[PDB]
């Protein structure tokens, strides 16, 4: 788990958890200091999972994207392990200028209104919020591993 990621509770706190209470881990938060984070809104089962994988093996971040379970998914069934409802936050998801491919950070540009309107259109990720200035996009997904 490189310097970029972080988990809550501590990788330490999680280590001391009873083999039993390592299945009811509530309020789990994994994030990348530069790209965004994912907050699980349901208890998570971290049993049978190497606590350092949640770093950049199981949960991974890249510009505007969040990938769960690298290639060849363990097939977590719904409500199992990590496949649970969660709030994902992606930083710098501004609209892009077509002739430059650079981010348009002005809150009133034509693309803004349309950009938001686009985000609200459920791409299997329920829109919760978009900050015109921050460019921060927040949405909810019912099943993390899907």
């Amino acid at each position: 788990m490189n310097e970029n990621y972080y988990i809550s509770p501590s990788l330490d706190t999680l280590s001391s958890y009873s083999l039993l209470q390592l299945r009811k881990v509530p309020h789990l938060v994994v994030g990348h200091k530069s790209y965004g984070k994912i907050e699980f809104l349901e208890p998570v089962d971290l049993a049978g999972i190497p606590l350092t994988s949640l770093g950049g093996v199981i949960i991974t971040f890249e510009p505007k994207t969040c990938i769960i379970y690298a290639n060849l998914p363990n097939r977590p069934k719904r409500g199992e392990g990590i496949n649970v409802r969660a709030r994902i936050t992606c930083f710098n998801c501004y609209p892009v200028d077509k002739s430059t491919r650079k981010p348009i950070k002005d809150p009133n540009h034509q693309l803004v209104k349309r950009h938001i309107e686009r985000l609200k259109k459920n791409p299997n990720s329920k829109f919760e919020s978009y900050d015109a200035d921050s460019g921060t996009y927040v949405f909810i997904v019912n099943h993390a591993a899907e």
Binding site: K64, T65, I67, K98, H115
Partner: protein
């Protein structure tokens, strides 16, 4: 002449081949084919026994004119026009003309077919490209079951923006033959591209084989140390690949085999469209077309928009081939040359290989023809003569012209008859012919 035996009737399609010399006519589930210079009578092959068409089906023809592809949202058929046969009676011989079939139900949530295209450079037209609602693009080898279809732009298990290309409205091959342009809608309209997008057996003549080898060498030399590491890798890969092609190229057939490994390529894009018209941010891209400017693969990319507008683009940078790199961008650059507002609802774009720098735009009741050879002809001269001067002054305005009034998006076809090129406009109810200059 509308008084030709093959035409008289009672879904209807018409296609031409070999410089408007051969005509193919579909009506009542029967294929009629007639070679204007070779036959005295036309011939037929009723295929009702294999497929009965309904107005939901789309049918396209390979440019060579040897194959037809009939499809709907669920299945695909590929038939061989019996050129050369005269008496197709044998039930066994007629089934020989049924070359390939596919249904989405053939797979174990099944995405339906949105569009199908023949790969422009597959040997014996053996490759069909299929775009599904999936935004998934698949290549089927019509002539080989020992080939598992190749699926590109597969769905991802990602969240957030731009995992892969989504919301593709149209597809179009570059006139280079190795590139596939995709027009998507996710953000009002953008262009992505698959380079290379190869069939299992690539049609490549000697002139073209050396062109991509030389372009490959120019870029290899163009490498320096500031060059991005990922780019450097691709350029070197490109040169290695094109060199291997040159080593296995069969000159007598002008073809070369391509291993499944080199056919899995990840999309490049979005392309930069500079300078993008501000108005268009309020509309959506509809279609994309590629128009040939000269005889050296020089082309213009054309894109449709909600506002009945058209933007003629030009690719100034040379792309490098890419297979792994996600979100690879690099010389994915397009420049705006002109914008054409037709203020009509553009329902589709069409081109006829036989006419350079000309594009047919089917609006709601008109078929207009945008002719940009006024400037395009000079543009290719300067590209080929490395002289920018001619461009100075040139007004980049295309000649717009109303071809005819339609009612149902007609089927077009170029027919060269007795020293006079013509345009056949086919529709449910009619079959018109019109003179074409040049």
């Amino acid at each position: 002449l509308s008084a030709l035996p093959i035409f008289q009737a009672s879904p209807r399609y018409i296609f031409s081949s070999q410089n408007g010399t051969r005509i193919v006519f579909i009506q009542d589930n029967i294929i009629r084919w007639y070679n204007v210079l070779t036959d005295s009578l036309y011939h037929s092959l009723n295929f009702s026994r294999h497929l009965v068409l309904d107005d939901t089906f789309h049918v396209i023809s390979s440019t060579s004119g040897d194959l037809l592809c009939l499809f709907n949202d669920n299945e695909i058929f590929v038939m061989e026009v019996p050129w050369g046969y005269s008496n197709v009676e044998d039930v066994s011989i007629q089934d020989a003309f049924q070359i390939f079939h596919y249904s989405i139900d053939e797979e174990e949530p099944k995405s339906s077919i949105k569009k199908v295209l023949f790969h422009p450079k597959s040997y014996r037209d053996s490759c069909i490209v299929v775009l599904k609602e999936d935004d998934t693009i698949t290549m089927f080898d019509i002539l080989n079951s020992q080939e598992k279809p190749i699926v590109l732009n597969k769905p991802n298990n990602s969240f957030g923006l731009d995992a892969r290309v989504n919301d593709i409205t149209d597809l179009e091959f570059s006139k280079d033959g190795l590139t596939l342009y995709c027009l998507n809608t996710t953000e009002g309209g953008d262009i992505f591209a698959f380079y290379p997008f190869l069939p299992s057996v690539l049609l490549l003549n000697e002139k073209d084989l050396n062109l991509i080898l030389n372009k490959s060498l120019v870029m290899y030399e163009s490498l320096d140390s500031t060059t991005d590491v990922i780019v450097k890798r691709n350029v070197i890969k490109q040169l290695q690949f094109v060199s291997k092609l040159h080593e296995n190229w069969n000159s007598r057939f002008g073809k070369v085999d391509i291993q499944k490994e080199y056919r899995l390529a990840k999309v490049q894009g979005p392309f930069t469209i500079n300078p993008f018209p501000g108005e268009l941010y309020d509309y959506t891209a509809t279609n994309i077309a590629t128009i040939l400017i000269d005889n050296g693969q020089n082309e213009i990319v054309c894109v449709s928009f909600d506002d009945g507008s058209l933007i003629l683009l030009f690719k100034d940078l040379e792309m490098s081939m890419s297979w792994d790199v996600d979100n690879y961008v690099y010389n994915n650059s397009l420049v705006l040359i002109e914008r054409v507002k037709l203020q009509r609802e553009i329902k589709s774009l069409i081109t006829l290989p036989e006419q350079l720098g000309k594009l047919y735009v089917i609006s709601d009741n008109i078929i207009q023809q945008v002719n940009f050879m006024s400037w395009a002809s000079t543009l290719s001269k300067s590209i080929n003569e490395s002289d920018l001067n001619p461009l100075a002054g040139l007004k980049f305005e295309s000649k717009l012209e109303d071809i005819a009034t339609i009612e149902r998006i007609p089927n077009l076809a170029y027919i060269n008859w007795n020293d006079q090129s013509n345009l056949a406009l086919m529709s449910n109810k009619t079959l018109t012919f019109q003179n074409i200059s040049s």
